[PDB]
Amino acid sequence: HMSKAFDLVVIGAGSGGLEAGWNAATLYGKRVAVVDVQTSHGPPFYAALGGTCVNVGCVPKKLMVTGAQYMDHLRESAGFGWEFDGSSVKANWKKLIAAKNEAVLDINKSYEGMFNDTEGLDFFLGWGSLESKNVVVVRETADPKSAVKERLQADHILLATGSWPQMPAIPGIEHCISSNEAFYLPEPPRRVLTVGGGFISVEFAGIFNAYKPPGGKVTLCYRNNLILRGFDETIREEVTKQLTANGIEIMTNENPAKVSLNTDGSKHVTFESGKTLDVDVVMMAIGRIPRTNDLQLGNVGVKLTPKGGVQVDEFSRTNVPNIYAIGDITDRLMLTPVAINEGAALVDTVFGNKPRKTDHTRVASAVFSIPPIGTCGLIEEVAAKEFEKVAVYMSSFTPLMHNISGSKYKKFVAKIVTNHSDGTVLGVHLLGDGAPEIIQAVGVCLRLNAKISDFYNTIGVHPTSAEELCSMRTPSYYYVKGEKMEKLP
């Protein structure tokens, strides 16, 4: 049996690696090999063909947030005249998970079909690692002593193995799970603690809160004062109030010290503060780390950053000439469309002789919390460090449908941050139903260097939440040499 030769070998058939592989083969005629550990979603390895987003990430989680939103629709319909037996209402978690599994498996099979079909785009099942500068080895397991399935010769090698949930070293960590297992729980937990203040912990808290059985309770804990570091502070505070208003307990300044099993098998969580909490599930969502350890990068000398990701330049090159890295393995912005963009830019540069580098600024993104967040660009405290004078335009209003729905607590917030010197928009931050869909074209605006007056000159679509972005023209306050103030001196 002979080794096989390729122009590009890709390790990891995920968001970035599939984009790079498809494009190299179909746009430029190269011969491409792509490696992944599993052909379809779920245990044992969770991620598989298609990547983390497709299998245990954006796609399943957005289906489950959608299912969770119906708790709000069913209740809110009554303000509009809808009547039904409220006592008969049941959230069937098994049906949600079965429907999600089926949709995900369909994408798995479609990816498998593409490979079986496409000229010069080949898939290989196993664990890829770097043997030498121009040879990828595929093994049966992650252990480098497991059996060799293939050796793939490669002029160019792309590292795109993604990331993995981080678990803290606490007594009883064996009793906790991560988001990977959360996607496959047989029954919805009566009491669940989600640990962490980031988007995964928040999104999952909203899912569990809608499907909990009668008498259930969702608790989110975070070790610092305010959840969702990195997002707009006004939105960080309002999303907390609205999560609380939907029945979620948010324990800030609290962090688990240990977990033990009660005699009945529930989990007994003890915090550093000495507080205790009994729950049926502890889901850790405290961060995600790049998957480097299994690539045997020492064999060829690929440098990692102090933080732990593969070091790359603006064109995704490592310190080894023909070896590249994109996506979550670079431990920077962990979003699917960034990985896809890096994959497309790398292939255009290397094989298309039209060079191009990914713009990591002004990336639009969303949090699918209930209610959701949309954001593009800088938060005000960051902009205030870089610009002499920053203006902040802010509109916070209850939409009219929530005058009737009951959920008067569902304020919509729109904020625009500018360079007050010339009116250039530095960032837009939104909270409320529709915010993820609204922000997308805001991203095109910022790539076109929109000023606040381009937003204000635009005639609104009425009645919408989004029209409030186009009717703001006096700042609510300023930052002058970093000092917040209602008025300019």
Ligand X SMILES: C[C@H]1C[C@@H]2CNC[C@@H]2N1C(=O)C(C)(C)C
Q: Which residues would be at the binding site for ligand X (CB under 6 A)? A: 59, 107, 397, 399-400, 463, 465, 467-468
Check if 175 is active-site: no
- By CB under 6 A, name the one of 13, 325, 416, 446 that touches ligand FAD: 13
**Least separation, in Å, of the C-beta of 56 and Na ion?**
17
- At how many degrees (to 10) do helices 93-117 and 58-76 cross? 150
Q: Taking CB under 8 A as the rule, does residue 305 contact a copy of itself? A: no
Is position 291 annotated in a ligand binding site?
no
CA separation for the pair 62, 60 (Å, rounded): 6
CA dist list (Å): 260 to 173, 196, 219, 265: 9, 19, 18, 9
| Footprint (CB under 5 A) of Br ion, residues 101-140 | none
Retrieve residue 342's tokens: 């890096």
- By CB under 5 A, name the one of 116, 141, 225, 403 that touches Br ion: 225
Asked whether 220 and 201 are in contact (CB, 8 A), the reply is yes
| Footprint (CB under 5 A) of Br ion, residues 438-477 | 453, 456, 473
Phi, psi dihedrals of residue 140, rounded to the nearest 5°: -75, -35
Close Cβ partners of 227 (under 8 Å, ≥ 6 residues apart): 197, 198, 201, 202, 220, 236, 239, 240, 250, 252
Q: Which residue, 414, 472, 458, 476, is CA-closest to 439?
A: 414
Q: Taking CB under 6 A as the rule, does residue 294 contact ligand FAD? A: yes
**Least separation, in Å, of the C-beta of 124 and ligand X?**
22
| Footprint (CB under 8 A) of a copy of itself, residues 327-356 | 335-338, 341
Of the residues 1, 360, 429, 462, only one is catalytic, namely 462
Is position 121 annotated in a ligand binding site?
yes
| 3-class secondary-structure state, position 337 | helix
| 3-class secondary-structure state, position 267 | strand
| Footprint (CB under 8 A) of a copy of itself, residues 274-303 | none
State which residue, 39 or 77, has the beta carbon closest to ligand FAD.
39
First-last CA distance in the chain: 78
Where does this chain bind ligand FAD (CB under 6 A)? 11-17, 35-37, 45, 47-48, 51-53, 57-58, 61, 127-128, 160-162, 179, 200, 291, 294-295, 327-329, 334-337, 339, 462
Positions marked active-site: 462
- Residues within the annotated binding site for NADPH? 197, 199-200, 203, 222-224, 229, 287, 334, 366
**Annotated binding-site members for NAD(+):** 196-203, 287
